[PDB]
UniProtKB/Swiss-Prot annotation, chains A, B, C, D, E, F:
Its main location: membrane. One of its GO terms (molecular function) is peptidase activity. Induction: By heat shock. Transcriptionally up-regulated by sigma-E factor and the Cpx two-component signal transduction pathway. Keywords: Cell inner membrane, Cell membrane, Disulfide bond, Hydrolase, Membrane, Protease, Repeat, Serine protease, Signal, Stress response. The keyword Magnesium does not apply. It catalyses: Acts on substrates that are at least partially unfolded. The cleavage site P1 residue is normally between a pair of hydrophobic residues, such as Val-|-Val. This is Periplasmic serine endoprotease DegP. The chain holds residues 37 to 379 of 474 of the full protein. It is an enzyme of class 3 (hydrolase). The keyword Disulfide bond applies.
Length: 301, 301, 301, 301, 301, 301
C-alpha cells in the first residue's frame, strides 16, 4: 500500500517517554504597582537508553531545578525518576527510572556514519499537547560536532529524540538558545555518539568531566616565545609539551604556535585556554598548528 | 523516473477550489487625530464534497459575514455559491455551488484508519497568491480528536484540504487561533470523519446541533451527594441517569462521580456541564468515572 | 528673596507618609521551557486625615492584597497600620496607624471651590526612590467629578496627595489604568470632598455603599411605555417613582423618559440601571430627563 | 489670596471653542483572514479670531477631510461651521461659524515681542475628555520661526490656543508629526503673527499662496557660472535678478552665490529652489549670500 | 538499505560554492546621545554554471556593493571572483572565478518540465554556519513565472540552489523582501530557465536588458480612442502597432484595448507601460486583449 | 507688567554654550543580508565655569570618544575646546576653550542651601534643535546626593545647566541611563557643589580620584570576628582602624560592625568594600554602624 513511517514509528515509540518535572526556583519579589521560592512545571521528552537500569536521556533545560520528576511511557504507565547528572553546555541530562519494568531501550546508531542527504525523524513535545512526530533530512553536520535537521517544529520547544529510518537513535535534539527552549529556524542536536559518551560520564561521575588541557606554554611575543621563529607570527605560542596530555599524543612539541580550532583562528594564547577548556572529555577537535605544516586531531584525556 | 506527488496531485486538484468572499462587518468609527459598515474581502480554499449538489466544504473564518461568495475551479471556471451552514467552534462551513456542472468530488478516507507515521499533503492559500501545495506526515492524533501535521506553512493562513497518498480526504486544515488565520508552528485539522458528520448536520439543520447532555445529577458534597460514599472524594457527583441520554447507554447509574474527560480531571459538576455541552453531536469523548472501576466512551445523542 | 514652595511644603510634608506594603497573591505556576502564592511588595504615599485615630488615606492599588502594611513619617518614624476599607472603583483606601502619636493631619480644602487656573502641587513616589514633589495647575474639572492636573510625573506611578498653595488637601491622585499604576499623559485625582465622603463610608461600613437606585420603570416601547407619548422617542422609559429614592426628590414622576447622565445619552433602560448603580453614595450626577423640559441633579441615598 | 490663572482664564475661555468633525476618507478594503469610503470623527480646539464673521482658527489635521463640522462654545452653545481654507504645511485651518451671535474674539499679541523666559498657557483637548488647560514657559523661539513651549501635554494631541498672562493669543499649538497628532516631548506652535498672516490668505484666496521665488540663476560650475569668481566656491550660483522678486529688494544682483537659509548651508541650486518654494508668502527667511560679505532678510512677494 | 539524498547530494555538492563578500557602503553618521563609508560583510551561496569560464550564479543581495568577493569550493579550495553583472529586480547576479581549475558545473534541468507534486531540495546558508541542505516539493508555479517550494528554512536567508532528484538545477532561491534576506513562510525562486536567460544577458551586456515595449497607442477616452468601439469600455486603448515590436508578432493591430497582464486587470494605459517595462527581455507574459476574443502570449524583443 | 524668566534668563544665557562633538568609535562590521572605526556626532550643552581659563563643564556622554570638540556661545561665536577630564560615573566632564575671550562665567550657588519647594529652570538641547529652556521645582534631594526636578523634557536628552531664580548654578542635569541620553520621567542632576568638587579633581588630576577606603577589617563570622559580640549579628565586621583613613576620623575603632550606607543595609563585608569604593573623593556618605549606638558621616580622603 502507501509508504509510511508508522510501521517503524511503532517500534520506536515505546522507547520514547514523556517527562513531567515539578521544581522550585529563586525569583525576585515583584515590585508594584506595575527573593522568594517559586514553583514551576517543566515538560519534555526523553529516550530510554538503558532498559535494565532504566536510564532515560533528556534535556538539561527540562530537568534543571527539579524537585519531582515523573515519567510516562507511551503505553500510559507512569514511574518516578531520579536525577543522575546534567550538562548545561550541551543541554543533556540523565535521569533514572525508579522501579523499571518491561522497558524497551532504543538501539543507538553510530552517528559517525551520518551523511547529509540522510532522512531523519524527530519525536517530542513542541507545545506540550503530547508527543509530536516530524520528519526531514540531515541538513548539516558539524563535522562530516552537531546535527542540524529540517525535521524541526517552528516556534516549538526543542523536543527529544532524533531517529533514522531503521528507528535507531542518531541524536537528541537540543535548544541552542538556553534558557529559552525555542527554534532558530532549523533543528540542532547532539549526535548520538557524543550523547553516549556524555551520558556515561554522568553515570560514572555525576557530571561530564571538562578536559581543559593545554600543556604549559608561554604567550607569543614573550621571553621564551620571541626567541624562536617569529616568521609568520600572529598567534598563540606553545613553549612546553611534557605534561603528555594529548600533546605527546598530538605530535606537538616545544616551540609550536597553534592558531586554529576547527576553522576559527586562535588569536591569543588564552583564546586556546578557554575554548579547549569548556569542551567535554572525549571530544574530537582539530588544531591548525603553525610550524610550516602541522594539523593533528586531539582526543581529550 | 523520479518519484513525485504531481501524478496523484493531478487527480486531486480538480476537487479543490478557490473561494473569493466579499462581505460587510460592523466596525468602530475611527477617532482622530491618531458604528459603521465596512466592506472586506476574505479568501480561502475548499473541497467539493458532493459533486451533484455542488457541496463545498470550507473554513468558517473564510465565509463568515459573507455577502457574496464566488468559487473558481482549478480549471478556471467560476460559479456563485450560497452559504448553507457554519460552525465557529471547529471552523468548518458548508457552501453550495449555484449551477454545478462537470464537478469532481473528492473521495474521503476513513480518518479512523490514520496512524502517526503516515504521509499527508496540504492544499490551500497561505498568502493569497494562489493554490499552494505542501507535504509532511501525521505528527499527532487527538485520539489514536484532531489531526496535527508538519505539512503546514509558516506564518501562513490555515489552508483547506488535507490529503493522503491515494489522493483521498483525511481532513480540513483549520486555524486554532480564530479570528486570526495563522500558524502555531504546526498544522491542526478536523479529521475527515468529524468533517463528514459535521457537514451533514449543516445540510440537515443549518448548523451542527450541540449535544449538551449530562443527565440530572447533584453537586458533590450536597444533600443527596454526601449521603453516599465520599471515600476517595473530590470530583463531580452524579445523582440521576433516567433521561437515558447516553447514560442508560454509558452504563452510568445513580451515585456515580465522574472526574475525567479524555484525560483532563473534572473538578466541579458544572465543569462537566460546560465541557460536554460545547461539543458537536456524534462526538466520541471518554469519561473517567469514579466508583472503583469505570470508564466508558459516549456518543452524543 | 526668591519665591518658593518650600515654606508651605514644610508645613504639609509632616501629614504625608510613605506606605510599605507586603502581600501575597495567587498566580499561575510557570510553564517551561519558556496555582500558587507569590509574595510581592507594593509601595505608595498617603495622607494623615485624622491625627487622633491615625487615619491615613491612600490608593487601593497600593494596599490591595496586603498582609503587612507599614507607615513611615517624613521625620523617619515608622508605625504599623491596619486596613480599614478600600474602593477599587475610585482607587481609594483607608488605613489606620497602630499606636498613633504626635501626628499631624492635613487641612482639607473644599474642592467645590476649585477653578481651572488654580495652582496645585503633587506629593508621592513615582519611581520608589522616595517622596517626590511636583507642581502644576488645575487642568480640568469633571464638574465645575474628577481633577485633572499637569502637576503629574511622566511614566510615574500615580502618587498620593494633591495640594493647593495654602497647603490644604484638594485631592488624592489616582491611576485610571488599574491594575497598572501609570500615566496617561496628565494627572487624574479624586477631589478632596469626594475623598472625604468616600473615606467616611469606609470607617462606618468597611466599604463605600453602592447607590444603585433607579425607581421601578419599564423599558421604552413596552406595554406601559408605548401607551404614553412616544413623541420624540428613543431613550429609557420610566414607569414608576413611588420608592421615593431620589425620585420623589428628583422631582421625577411616572411617564418620564431619561436619556442622559452628565452628557452621555442614555440609550437603553438598563444603561441607566448600570451606570447609576456602580457609583458611590452621595454622588452628584445630572439626568437629562425627557418630558419637554426637565433636568435635575440627584444625591444618592 | 492665592495666585491663580483662573481669573484671566475666565476671560480667555469664551474665545476658545470645541470642534467636532465628521468626515469620510478613502481606505483599503481589509484582506482576511488576518477601495471604499470610511466614516471617521476628528476632534480639536480652536480660537474665535473674528467675532463678527465668526472666524475660528484651528488645526488642519482636525478639519481635514471634513463633511460636517460643529462648534461648541465654552458656555454650551453649538453652531454649524463651514470650511474656508487649510494649510497642511503649517497645520493651520480657518473655519467659519454659520450664524455667529454674541461671540467673543481673542486679542492677539504681537508674537515678535516674545522672549524665552516668558510664561504661556495652552488650552485644548489632549485626550478628547474636554477642554484641558496647562501652563509653562517659552522654551525656544525659531527666530528671536516657531514657538516651542514646555506647556504641552505628554502623549497628548497638539491642542489649540497658546496664550500669555494677559490672556492674549501668542500662537496655535500644532503637531509636527502629521498625520499623527502627538508629542515629541515638547510643544511646537505657529507664532500668532504667522498665524494671522496665514489666516488672511485663507480668507482672501481659499489657501495660503506659496512664494516659490528665486529669480533666474544658473547652477554653480556651469557656463555663465564658472566664468566668474570660483574663489571660495561650493554653493548655489545666482546669474540674474531682473525679475525684481525680493532680489532687487534683497539687494541681490548678478553673480551672487547664496549658500545659506537661516543657518543650514545651501548645497545645490535646486536646494534653494525647493526650500524657499515650500514656504508661505510674507515669510521672513535669511540668506547667507557669498560675495565677500552679504546676508539680507527677504519678505515673500 | 535506507533511502537517502546523500548519494545524489554528493554529486551536486561540488557545483555549489560559498561566497564571502566584503564591501563598503555609504551610511548616515550616527547622531548622539542615543555621510561616511562603512565596511560590511555579506555571505551567500552560488552555483557553478560554466565550469570552463568559472561562471558562478548567485544572488544580487549578496554581491551588491562588493569590493572583494571570494569563493570557496565544497572541497575547501578558495578562489577570487570578479563581478560580471547583477539584477536587483530578480535578485540574480553572475560572478566569475579568477583562475578556475578542476571545476564542476551543474546540469540545468528544463524548468518548463516542472509540475507541482515534484520533489526538490535547497542548498545554502540560512544562518551563516555553513552549507545547509533541506528538502520539500514544488508548492506552486507562477505559470504551469516563479517557483514556490516548502523546501525553505524558517527565519533563514534565501539560500542559493534549488535542485531535483537527479541533482539538476531547477532554480535559484531568492528573497522577495529585499534588501532583507528572509522568509515569508515559504520559498520563492527564479526557475532555472529564467535563470539561464537572465544570466546570458549579464555575460553579454553587463546587465539584463529591460524590454519596455508597448507599441504606440493613445489612452482610452481620448481623441483617436473614443472614436471607435467603446462598447465594453474601461481599459487601456491601443492606437498603433507598426513598430513591429511583438505587436506585428502578438497578432495585435490598431484599435485594440488590452486590459490584462497574466490575470491582473490593466486599468490605465500607463499601467501597461510600466508593468511590461520593468520585466526582463525574453519574458513570457500574457495579455488579455479586448476586441471580442483575443489573448496572445508575447516574447520580449 | 507680566512676570517672566526672560530677564534673568538674559543674564544666564551667555554662560551657557552649545557643544558640537565629532568622534570615532570601534564598531562591529555589519553581517548581511539583514571591527572598524565609525564616525559619529554628539551634541550637548555646557556651562562656562571659569571665564579666564575658559573652563566649560559638560556631560561625559557628550564629549566621550571625541576627536574634535567645538563650542558656540549664545552670541554666535565659535571656539575650539580641548578635553581635560571626564567621569562616567556621574556623567560629568570638563572641557577647555582654546583662546577664551570676553567670556562670562556663571555664579554657582551653594547647593547645600537647596530645599524641595524651590524653583529651578533647565537649559539644554533635548532634540538638537537648539538651546531649549524649561522650568519646574526641586522635586527631591538625595540628601536634604542628587537633584531631582520636574523641570525636565519628556523623551529628551538630559540637557546641561540647572539654575535658580537668581540665575546661579545649582547643578548639571545628567542621564542616569547611560549610554542612553534620555528621560525616566523626571530630571536627575549632580548638585552644583558635587559638581565643583568633581570638576577641580579633573583640572588637578585628569580625573576624579576614587576614594575606595575601608580600613582593614575581617568578615563577620570569621576568626577575629566571631570572637567578640555576635549579639545582634548579621552584617559587615570591622577588625582594624589604624590606617586613620576617615576611621580615626569616623570615630570608628576595632570590633565595629557596619551595616548601612545612607539607608541601604550593608549585608556582606565586600558590600562595603565595593559601594564605598566607586564613589568620588570628598563624598559625604553616612554609615549605620552597629555597636549599640553609632552612626557618623564620613568625608573621603
Amino acid at each position: 500500500q502507501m509508504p509510511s513511517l508508522a510501521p517503524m514509528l511503532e517500534k520506536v515509540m515505546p522507547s520514547v517517554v514523556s517527562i513531567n518535572v515539578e521544581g522550585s526556583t529563586t525569583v525576585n519579589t515583584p515590585r508594584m504597582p506595575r527573593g522568594q521560592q517559586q514553583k514551576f512545571m517543566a515538560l519534555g521528552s526523553g529516550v530510554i537508553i538503558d532498559a535494565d537500569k532504566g536510564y532515560v536521556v533528556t534535556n538539561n533545560h527540562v530537568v534543571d531545578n527539579a524537585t519531582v520528576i515523573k515519567v510516562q511511557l507511551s503505553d500510559g504507565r507512569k514511574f518516578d525518576a531520579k536525577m543522575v547528572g546534567k550538562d548545561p553546555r550541551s543541554d543533556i541530562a540523565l535521569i533514572q527510572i525508579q522501579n523499571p519494568k518491561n522497558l524497551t531501550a532504543i538501539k543507538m546508531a553510530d552517528s559517525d556514519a551520518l551523511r547529509v542527504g540522510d532522512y531523519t525523524v524527530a519525536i517530542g513535545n513542541p507545545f506540550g499537547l503530547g508527543e509530536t512526530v516530524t520528519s526531514g533530512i540531515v541538513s548539516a553536520l558539524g563535522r562530516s560536532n552537531f546535527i542540524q535537521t529540517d525535521a524541526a517544529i517552528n516556534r516549538g520547544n526543542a523536543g527529544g529524540a532524533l531517529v533514522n529510518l531503521n528507528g535507531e537513535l542518531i541524536g537528541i535534539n537540543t535548544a541552542i538558545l538556553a534558557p529559552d527552549g525555542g527554534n532558530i529556524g532549523i533543528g540542532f542536536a547532539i549526535p548520538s555518539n557524543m550523547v553516549k559518551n556524555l551520558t556515561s560520564q554522568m553515570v560514572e561521575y555525576g557530571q561530564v568531566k571538562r578536559g581543559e588541557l593545554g600543556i604549559m606554554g608561554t604567550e607569543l611575543n614573550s621571553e621564551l616565545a620571541k626567541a624562536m621563529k617569529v616568521d609568520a607570527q600572529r598567534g598563540a605560542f606553545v613553549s612546553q609539551v611534557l605534561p603528555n596530555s594529548s600533546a605527546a599524543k598530538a605530535g606537538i612539541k616545544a616551540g609550536d604556535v597553534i592558531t586554529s580550532l576547527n576553522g576559527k583562528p586562535i588569536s591569543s594564547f588564552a583564546a586556546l585556554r578557554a575554548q579547549v577548556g569548556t569542551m567535554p572529555v572525549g571530544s574530537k577537535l582539530t588544531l591548525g598548528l603553525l610550524r610550516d605544516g602541522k594539523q593533528v586531531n586531539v582526543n581529550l584525556e
